[PDB]
Write a protein that binds this ligand. Structure first.
Ligand code: HEM
Ligand SMILES: CC1(C)[C@@H]2CC[C@@]1(C)C(=O)C2
Length: 408
């Protein structure tokens, strides 16, 4: 049964569209394909859905980009739908606007900046190689369970100085954050609340132990950056360390799944990467344009008119980032990966002050993955008649990716 909310007085009937972000129409054909169904040639730039507590959806890249760049008009005080889940959300600094946001982003950047991430290249490669060598000679693997859910998790837990045996419990918490269970806005609120508490419980003893610590891990490094000339307060620390874990463990895992399904269906594109290693390296951003996974929200700060649409203070707008990278008004033939594409502009990492702090790490993980994969498994395909299983939500997910190849 679908839960509907009635539209508020300011929402006109002509803008109403029945779109369920947690179970998109057509999702069985793919997450990206399902979102693209919403973006028809004449659909309005902002449409309102009665599902998920009732909210707006931005349907074009220019709006998505503009909203992310405009925190004074579109606040991060709520960035999840439904509203109940967004109000329960307690991660730092994603819940903050400038200027409160900036010293915390500065702290994170101390650990995740490009120069710091470059130092990680060989550790990441060693991890990728070890995993790939486990199955490269076999001629088949289920890519999700055997690689994409393994590689980025081992990378991040190592970087954070945490036991790999914690992967399962952290993954379960991530699932309920980004794809909370429930068929009602209040049920999803409760699911997110419990997940966020689980993260806080996990992170608290680590914080207590690493304050003033001498560890070289990511958490110690960021935790001990001063905020306004003082140690970071406890409440902020819980949200900050929890966000590092959530950011590091869900998005890349799912991104790799979507990317690999495409590559398994496009051997010409794989072959180009093999023949021209610089095309691979320079082409990674095109993969980020094509395989967006995040759809999150902003809070309308004041009554306003925006792109010809009347908005009220407190309205939530969902930003499905796939609708920037795949917007046909921004990119010709947007569903094809063209490694030589000159304009790859996208909001896969969002825009503005919150633009992904882990983007350098994400790019490096993907680059290293493709390099070590193609070195050992140069050609591959999706198993005949295989059907991947898709999930939509704040972060998209995919599973069941059986790959086959002739061992080289
Ligand atoms: C495919 C990979 C990734 C994608 C698509 C992605 C996407 C995003 C997006 C859209 C945001 C903006 C959220 C918002 O404010 O609405 C964000 C923020 C953030 N991401 Fe990533 N992310 C990825 C990987 C990572 C990784 C590996 C980390 C490592 C810790 C990370 C850490 C963060 C952090 C800390 C923020 C908050 C930055 C701030 O609020 O100033 N992300 N990410
Ligand atoms: C939307 C995100 C990808 C970004 C980092 C992790 C995530 C789930 C957040 O809560 C903010």
């Amino acid at each position: 049964q679908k839960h509907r909310v009635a539209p508020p007085p300011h929402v006109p009937g002509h803008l109403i569209r029945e779109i369920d972000a947690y179970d998109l129409d057509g999702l069985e054909q793919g997450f990206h394909e399902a979102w693209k169904r919403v973006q028809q040639p004449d659909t309005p730039p902002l449409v309102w859905t009665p599902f998920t507590g009732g909210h707006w959806i931005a349907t074009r890249g220019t709006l998505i980009d503009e909203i992310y760049r405009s925190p004074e008009r579109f606040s991060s005080r709520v960035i999840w739908v439904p509203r109940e889940a967004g109000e329960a959300y307690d991660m730092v600094p994603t819940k903050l606007d400038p200027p409160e946001h900036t010293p915390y982003r500065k702290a994170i950047d101390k650990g995740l900046n490009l120069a710091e991430i470059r130092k990680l290249e060989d550790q990441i490669r060693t991890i990728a190689v070890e995993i790939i060598e486990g199955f490269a000679d076999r001629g088949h693997c289920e890519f999700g369970s055997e690689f994409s859910t393994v590689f980025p998790v081992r990378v991040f837990l190592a970087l954070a100085g945490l036991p790999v045996e914690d992967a399962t419990k952290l993954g379960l918490l991530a699932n309920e954050m980004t794809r909370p269970s429930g068929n009602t806005p209040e049920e999803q609120g409760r699911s997110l609340e419990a997940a966020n508490k689980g993260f806080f419980e996990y992170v608290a003893p680590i914080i207590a132990a690493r304050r003033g610590g001498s560890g070289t891990d990511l958490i110690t490094r960021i935790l001990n950056v001063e905020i306004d000339g003082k140690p970071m307060p406890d409440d902020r620390a819980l949200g900050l360390v929890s966000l590092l874990l959530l950011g590091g463990l869900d998005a890349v895992v799912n991104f790799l799944g979507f990317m690999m399904i495409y590559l398994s269906r496009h051997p010409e594109t794989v072959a180009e990467m093999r023949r021209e290693p610089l095309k691979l390296q320079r082409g990674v951003e095109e993969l980020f344009r094509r395989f967006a996974v995040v759809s999150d929200a902003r809070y309308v700060v004041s009554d306003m008119e925006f792109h010809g649409t009347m908005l009220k203070e407190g309205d939530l707008i969902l930003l499905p980032t796939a609708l920037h990278g795949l917007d046909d008004r921004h990119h010709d033939d947007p569903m094809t990966v063209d490694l030589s594409r000159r304009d790859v502009t996208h909001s896969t990492f969002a825009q503005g002050p919150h633009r992904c702090a882990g983007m350098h790490l994400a790019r490096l993980e993907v680059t290293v993955m493709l390099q070590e994969w193609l070195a050992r498994i140069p050609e591959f395909r999706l198993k005949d008649r295989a059907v991947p299983i898709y999930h939509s939500g704040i972060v998209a997910a995919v599973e069941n990716i059986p790959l086959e190849w002739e061992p080289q």
